[PDB]
Design an enzyme around this catalytic site. Sequence first.
Site, PDB file in Angstrom:
ATOM      1  N   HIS A  26      -7.938   8.455  -1.126  1.00 17.76           N
ATOM      2  CA  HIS A  26      -7.904   7.525   0.000  1.00 17.76           C
ATOM      3  C   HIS A  26      -9.052   7.811   0.988  1.00 17.76           C
ATOM      4  CE1 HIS A  26      -6.006   5.307   3.463  1.00 17.76           C
ATOM      5  NE2 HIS A  26      -5.565   4.548   2.475  1.00 17.76           N
ATOM      6  N   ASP A  79       0.919  -1.139   0.000  1.00 21.61           N
ATOM      7  CA  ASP A  79       0.000   0.000   0.000  1.00 21.61           C
ATOM      8  C   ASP A  79       0.955   1.184   0.000  1.00 21.61           C
ATOM      9  OD1 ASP A  79      -2.223  -1.607   0.124  1.00 21.61           O
ATOM     10  OD2 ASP A  79      -2.889  -0.997   2.126  1.00 21.61           O
ATOM     11  N   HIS A  92       4.155  -2.113   3.705  1.00 24.12           N
ATOM     12  CA  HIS A  92       4.315  -0.690   3.453  1.00 24.12           C
ATOM     13  C   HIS A  92       5.826  -0.572   3.216  1.00 24.12           C
ATOM     14  CE1 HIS A  92       0.558  -0.798   5.851  1.00 24.12           C
ATOM     15  NE2 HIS A  92       0.200   0.138   4.986  1.00 24.12           N
ATOM     16  N   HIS A 133      -5.607   2.211  -5.021  1.00 22.80           N
ATOM     17  CA  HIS A 133      -5.878   2.453  -3.608  1.00 22.80           C
ATOM     18  C   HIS A 133      -6.709   3.743  -3.474  1.00 22.80           C
ATOM     19  CE1 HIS A 133      -5.490   1.275   0.439  1.00 22.80           C
ATOM     20  NE2 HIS A 133      -4.452   2.007   0.805  1.00 22.80           N
TER      21      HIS A 133
END
Length: 235
Positions: A105, A50, A199, A101
């Site tokens: 967000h 992500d 991440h 994504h």
Amino acid sequence: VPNEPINWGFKRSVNHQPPDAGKQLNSLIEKYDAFYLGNTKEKTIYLTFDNGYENGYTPKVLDVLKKHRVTGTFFVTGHFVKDQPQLIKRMSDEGHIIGNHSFHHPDLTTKTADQIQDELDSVNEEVYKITGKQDNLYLRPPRGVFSEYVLKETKRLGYQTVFWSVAFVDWKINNQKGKKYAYDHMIKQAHPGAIYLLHTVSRDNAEALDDAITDLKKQGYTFKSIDDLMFEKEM
């Protein structure tokens, strides 16, 4: 609808066995185009990331993935793509998959179908401006929050919603625990068909990944991509 907020979560893997999200979630998942596990019948792991902002390590993560010859799936936000066009270009040029994504967000359950469409298309629009290409459509809900409405609406928009089965705290900038912390979680939660969510903002995360892939490969695991996952299950 129903548009009841739901947060992707699950009791972590134990014994190197795939976790289970529950009869309730499993049902909703299957009802639509969404999954959190790959082929549990084989020793395979699928790495996903992500990316909402950059903190200096993504280049090394890409170097690591290249070194081990592994294909990552990077779920990016609109801010990430606009702030880092070159990393986006590297992901594309280096064989990786760029996932969605969402642009801002947001919590998609607070959005209209109209808004949802723009939130997702604008990310591809920006990635295309940069790469001249476009991957199969994969979605990872911002904040891991979804609902039946969101699954239905994004599915109707052509997206495959991808959750995960392995994740840990590697996103707290105020408390970056280091290499061992991340590595141990990656080794301990490993299981057949695992979909890792990582991440690239925490200290030594690339080194932890490097070691984890070296050791997981030594353990007999093969690392595949989300496209591989889709194509193979379709076989």
